Amino acid sequence: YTRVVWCAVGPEEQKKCQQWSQQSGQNVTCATASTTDDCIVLVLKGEADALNLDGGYIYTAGKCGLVPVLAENRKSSKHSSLDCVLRPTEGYLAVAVVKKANEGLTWNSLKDKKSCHTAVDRTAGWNIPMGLIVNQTGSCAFDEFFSQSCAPGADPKSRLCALCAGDDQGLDKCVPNSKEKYYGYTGAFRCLAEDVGDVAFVKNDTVWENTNGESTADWAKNLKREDFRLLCLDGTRKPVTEAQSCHLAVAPNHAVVSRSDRAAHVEQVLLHQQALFGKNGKNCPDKFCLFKSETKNLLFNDNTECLAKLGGRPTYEEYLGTEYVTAIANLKKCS
């Protein structure tokens, strides 16, 4: 009275959710769907209570009446004395990353190159760069801008899925869940690391967390930061240490959404679950860590220090911020 039903997107998330459910003594249980939109529909039906969402997906969910409950908060610098749960979120930096060896690729020569995106409809992977590109080109044909891409959730026969690899059997090409090899922040970055794409739209933290031994995964373990450059909007290229002055946008942190009528109970249960399984949690690392998944960002980003309270009981528009909402709205006019 009552259990919270989390929605897991794809089978790797479903497995993590099932471990969480077991450890929480079924205080949390799991529904699973193949895509984040299908999870949003399970919550709208009442077949699930909540899930953690990128800002682009919060827009879809919020147009349908779901509300933000708690936000991811990653390691800060300022606000230091404040407990993680009470500290205001800082946003993350959406960036365009290329290889340093691909000399002379800039923001202004992206046309006809190969791109890697976290998925359609996500902030850094899609809404920010494609919104900027539609605006700059004066054209809605963003599906004709890059010669080939991996943009999970697009039509699998279209050139926006031509670079996606599917799963270890080569099935599920372009599905927008972690079974697609190039899904998400770490998939899109891998798509660039392997030179499948010329440019990856991810965030600043991705490049750091998957280079210089920060990841031990096969594909990442040998990557060096100095082999990558960020593309700035003024046409310059900078080292990845310069993301504060060479980003596309500042994104609102991923956050938990629920139906409005279950938001308070979801919130209470999550605060208690993170005291057990969170960053310094009573049962992490012995038993289960809610914010780890071997770099695969399952359910939550691996870099989440806590889920934090939101100030001002914000609506989804308030949480995303007016400017981002308007940019999404403008880009969605193309389709």
Binding site: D37, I40, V41, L44, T60, K63, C64, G65
Partner: peptide, 6 residues
């Protein structure tokens, strides 16, 4: 226009 997508 301004509605839910589902």
């Amino acid at each position: 226009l301004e509605a839910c997508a589902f």
